[PDB]
Amino acid sequence: SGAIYVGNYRVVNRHLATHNDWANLVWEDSSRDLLVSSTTAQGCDTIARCDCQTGVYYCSSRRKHYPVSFSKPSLIFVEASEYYPARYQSHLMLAVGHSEPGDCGGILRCQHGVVGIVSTGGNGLVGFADVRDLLWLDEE
Ligand SMILES: CNS(=O)(=O)c1ccccc1Cl
Ligand SMILES: [Zn+2]
Numbered sequence: 001s002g003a004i005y006v007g008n009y010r011v012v013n014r015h016l017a018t019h020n021d022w023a024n025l026v027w028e029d030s031s032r033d034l035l036v037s038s039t040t041a042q043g044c045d046t047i048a049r050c051d052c053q054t055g056v057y058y059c060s061s062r063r064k065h066y067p068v069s070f071s072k073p074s075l076i077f078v079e080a081s082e083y084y085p086a087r088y089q090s091h092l093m094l095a096v097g098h099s100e101p102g103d104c105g106g107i108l109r110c111q112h113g114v115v116g117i118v119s120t121g122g123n124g125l126v127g128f129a130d131v132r133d134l135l136w137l138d139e140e
Pocket of ligand 1: 073075089
């Protein structure tokens with residue numbers, strides 16, 4: 001679990017979105033495993049605007065933050081998980097590291113702020129859904 005709180009926006013994994021998220025929907029994309037809903041309170045997070053390939057992510061299943069190198073956002077084949085079939089996921093970044101299903105929502109950050117959230121794992125990789133292209137998160 002986990003979300004990004006930027007302005008009056010909540011960014012979650014689409015597969016973990018609540019009824020309240022869907023009832024307050026701003027934007028969702030299944031191919032990216034992202035959903036954004038409206039908030040009443042303003043949030044503490046800053047979105048990275050950058051092409052960093054190094055940063056740090058939170059892994060709830062280790063209670064640890066790990067420094068990683070990660071690929072640039074790409075269209076990647078993902079094997080079946082408890083929450084999705086085998087399918088192609090867009091805007092996905094991969095690193096070498098530990099990720100189980102409950103680790104989804106964990107933040108990946110770089111020197112510029114929040115890069116994305118854990119979305120995939122298995123086979124010694126963790127995949128992160130990028131949010132750095134979502135410029136509209138920073139306004140309105
Ligand atoms: C797998 N998706 S993707 O290649 O990251 C991508 C798709 C559409 C627009 C921009 C990008 Cl980066
Ligand atoms: Zn950066």
